[PDB]
């Protein structure tokens, strides 16, 4: 039928990466899919605001970097920045 967009298998791939001896129910899968989409709307909404606040037309990696510092506080923020920085450098290399 019609395909619907979801992160059912990507959360599964992340779960098996660090915890290869556990499973997950579909109810918990939908919560994780809800959690990913809600954070996705918050960061992209902040990145959309950040470009409009500086009269900029495009959203770069610094817009995502600035957005996650506003939402994620303190200790949780610096790992997201470090993982974000190491992903960009690996992508460009």
């Amino acid at each position: 039928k019609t395909r619907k967009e979801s992160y059912a298998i990507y959360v599964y791939k992340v779960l098996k990466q660090v915890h290869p001896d556990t499973g997950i129910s579909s109810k918990a899968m939908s919560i994780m899919n809800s959690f990913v989409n809600d954070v996705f709307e918050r960061i992209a909404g902040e990145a959309s605001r950040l470009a409009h606040y500086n009269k900029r037309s495009t959203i770069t990696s610094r817009e995502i970097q600035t957005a996650v510092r506003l939402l994620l506080p303190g200790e949780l923020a610096k790992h997201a920045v470090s993982e974000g920085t190491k992903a960009v450098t690996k992508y460009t290399s």
Partner: protein
């Protein structure tokens, strides 16, 4: 053309970089979306996914459970101080609240 190598494997990631880039363009956020914007967004989403699931697995092994139950996801969020602050105004279905008792209650 060349081999259709996914952008997730190029950045050492499992979350779909192309899917994240697609909803950025069609989500009515900006006129253009940069090249590194979906890469940065996927890395942040992966870390939040991995951190929650790691603590959920720790909560699953606390009560000797293999399957992840939505109580374990709620227990992972509330126990972590950063996850509690980030998701303070977030309601999780089939999760309840923390099983804590006041000192004067006993």
């Amino acid at each position: 053309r060349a081999k259709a190598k996914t952008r997730s494997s190029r950045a050492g990631l499992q979350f779909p970089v192309g899917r994240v880039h697609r909803l950025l363009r069609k989500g009515n956020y900006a006129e253009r979306v940069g090249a590194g914007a979906p890469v940065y967004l996927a890395a942040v989403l992966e870390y939040l996914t991995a951190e929650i699931l790691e603590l959920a697995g720790n909560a699953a092994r606390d009560n000797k459970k293999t399957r992840i139950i939505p109580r374990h996801l709620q227990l992972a969020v509330r126990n972590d101080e950063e996850l509690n602050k980030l998701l303070g105004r977030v309601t999780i279905a089939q999760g309840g609240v923390l099983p804590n008792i006041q000192s004067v209650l006993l």
